[PDB]
Design a protein around this nucleic acid. Sequence first.
DNA 1: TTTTTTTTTTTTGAGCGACTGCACTACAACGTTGTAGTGCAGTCGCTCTTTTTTTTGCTGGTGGTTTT
Lengths: 125, 98, 72, 187, 147, 49, 62, 98
Amino acid sequence: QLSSKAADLFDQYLVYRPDWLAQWETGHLVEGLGEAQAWQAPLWKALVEYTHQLGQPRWHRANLYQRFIETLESATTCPPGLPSRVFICGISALPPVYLQALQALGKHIEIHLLFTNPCRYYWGD
Amino acid sequence: RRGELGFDDMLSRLDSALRSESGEVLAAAIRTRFPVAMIDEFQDTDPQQYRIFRRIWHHQPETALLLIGDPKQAIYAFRGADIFTYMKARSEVHAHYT
Amino acid sequence: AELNAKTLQRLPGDNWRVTSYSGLQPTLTPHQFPRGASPGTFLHSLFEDLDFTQPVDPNWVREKLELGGFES
Amino acid sequence: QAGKAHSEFVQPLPFTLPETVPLETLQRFWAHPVRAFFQMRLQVNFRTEDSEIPDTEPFILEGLSRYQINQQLLNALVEQDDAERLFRRFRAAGDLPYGAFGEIFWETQCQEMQQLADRVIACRQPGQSMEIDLACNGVQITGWLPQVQPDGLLRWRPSLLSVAQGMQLWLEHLVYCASGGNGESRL
Amino acid sequence: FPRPLTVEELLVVTFTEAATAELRGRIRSNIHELRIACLRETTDNPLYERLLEEIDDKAQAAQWLLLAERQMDEAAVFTIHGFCQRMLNLNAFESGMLFEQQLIEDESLLRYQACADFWRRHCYPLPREIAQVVFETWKGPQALLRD
Amino acid sequence: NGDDARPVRASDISVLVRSRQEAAQVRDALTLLEIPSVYLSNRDSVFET
Amino acid sequence: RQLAPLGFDLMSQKPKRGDRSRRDDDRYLFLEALISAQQKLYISYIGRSIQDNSERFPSVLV
Amino acid sequence: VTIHKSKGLEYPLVWLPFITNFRVQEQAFYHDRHSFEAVLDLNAAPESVDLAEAERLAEDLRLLYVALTRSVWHCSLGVAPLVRRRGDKKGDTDVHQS
DNA sequence: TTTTTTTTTTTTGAGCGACTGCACTACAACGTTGTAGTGCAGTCGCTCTTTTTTTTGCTGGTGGTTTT
């Protein structure tokens, strides 16, 4: 149950916090977090070393996401297999973590994000 | 063995967790979570519950304990309540308000 | 006090439904193949998944029959 | 609220009394009259579901199992049979508690049934079943009476003092004294 | 108090769940009434009048009451067993508890099973001279469980 | 209440008992005089009726 | 719905903009259901109990 | 409504027909008057029986207070010389035991 | 490897404590007898509460029901 809860937290960090795991892979802690960090970052580093020692591939969600951003930002020529225009209807049709990949995709693919806001002025922070 | 739990098992497990050495620091974590307590219906108080409340909020600074109740309404002695726990709580505390 | 129940004048909805075509309706040979809905859908999935430009590989057909559960 | 209410269940029904009415029908009627009106006249017998299997062995004796044990013990002690063989027979079936508690239960039930049998076989005579043919109010009653001794009627049951058993003994005494049979009836 | 506290730091403990719901509704209504009386600088209640007279600032108190009205859904008004279960599930490392457990409402069946196990492991290998006294004390394990 | 008046309905009068047997005694003594009464402390199951 | 935090997750201690939360998602779902209603809105809730006729309070949003 | 189910409620007119009926506790389970801990006496000692009957009488007085403090306009009581003892006319009644 | 029948319920309280009747000796009133106190046994009332406490991922994220 402890391994299942830690794997759930690691999957949630892979989805939402790529910079925390990218810093934990180097071996450096993050200043300003809670008490439950001294047993998670060496566990994550040992997990990365264990999956690198095994025959399983290195790639996961966060590093492939960063590699996708890097290979769409530095590439001058558009790679084949990409569509022309992509419609995104609704707010929950894209979670607010893939917006950097959407900005990378907008350089080569016309993206129409149909946004449903209840107010017409600016009301955010 | 079955991994199940009961209603009194929560009180017994919290009392056994506070009964240990490190669990007092856990009580300090409760002092990091809720630094106040307003406990209604203190006539229906088990001795395990009063032991938990005394271990968490006896004399630590910045935390307040407000036991609101009535000793003339303790009619749940068949269920597990006890007015002698309320009399022990009255003998332990110093202030009284009516 | 007197009371009566109201009678519905018009129908609540017409015959509105999202339907399909089905709603409006020697020892080893393909003639000896078992005829059914499930082998038909299996052959349809085989014709859907297989690429037409690439040549057919026998080990791929063996893997598809192992995944489907037919005879080797 | 414009409907009729529930009318009363008791209604005057037409009924013709037949010629030959058996004694068993009269015994089933005077054992329970409302049940005999339900399950025989309009043939409505309310079938209740059987009890579920208990999750543990019987540690005590109560109810129908205790009544069957007392009935078999009273039928065994009325013929001066060996009670230890019936004890081993009930222990081999699992109806008795395990160990010494079953022996204690069998000892107190054997003491009670021996106290009852000392009164039962104090005035017991060997009697056989006889036939009953009566004609009352133009109605024929045909039946059989079991264990008719020359002293009268002798019945024994391991139950309490109730009025249904008294009604049954009174019906048997009326059907016994109507065709000969001078003597008392005892239960 | 030395510092003002939020809605997620005030702990109210009441045993009955309907009493906690009624107290949560009454505290929400009192928060709304005090927010209205602080925005209007007047009230029809004498205790609310003294509450308005005790504060010098009106805008910050009304903003705090609006934040309390918005955070009343996340209020810490729990029962006894609910607060104990939340403290066990929150700090599971210091307590030594599991993460997912099944809660049973009635423990009478397991108690009767344990009493039957005790009666089997104690009263069965006893001889007649002790089992007679055990039978004189209780007929079976049901009378002992009732005691 | 002051000058306001209210007639006493059947929901105002409440009988405070301690057990279930004396509650059934009160209910049987009250239903004999054509007065219906409810038992708010009735924890009996519907599957036993 | 309100879901208790695990207790040792760092995302609950420090929240960000793009963080999943069941409370804020339901409070925005109620606003989207209020906006999406074109002609008629029919909100129904249990205001009275059927057991002891006790008063039941509605949600904070309603 | 029972006395335990009438705690915290409100009733205009309250009738108490059987408030004089009392129950004598036989089991010896009491609390110490100094340590305030639950003491269960398995032996039939009369001191533990009296110390448990005192707590039973205090619980009955608390039930009487709870049942009396729920009326608003009018409360009615049923008083009678109830005798728990099997003697018919012994010169004394058991109303002081209630 | 085939296949037959069948509609009858029962039982369940016991320990605590008093009322009343008959026997049985101790002792004072008038050797014997009436009154008083206690033991034992058959018979009978009575009476046996009250109640509630909860975490469970809406779609947690390569996800997704239905036609030929």
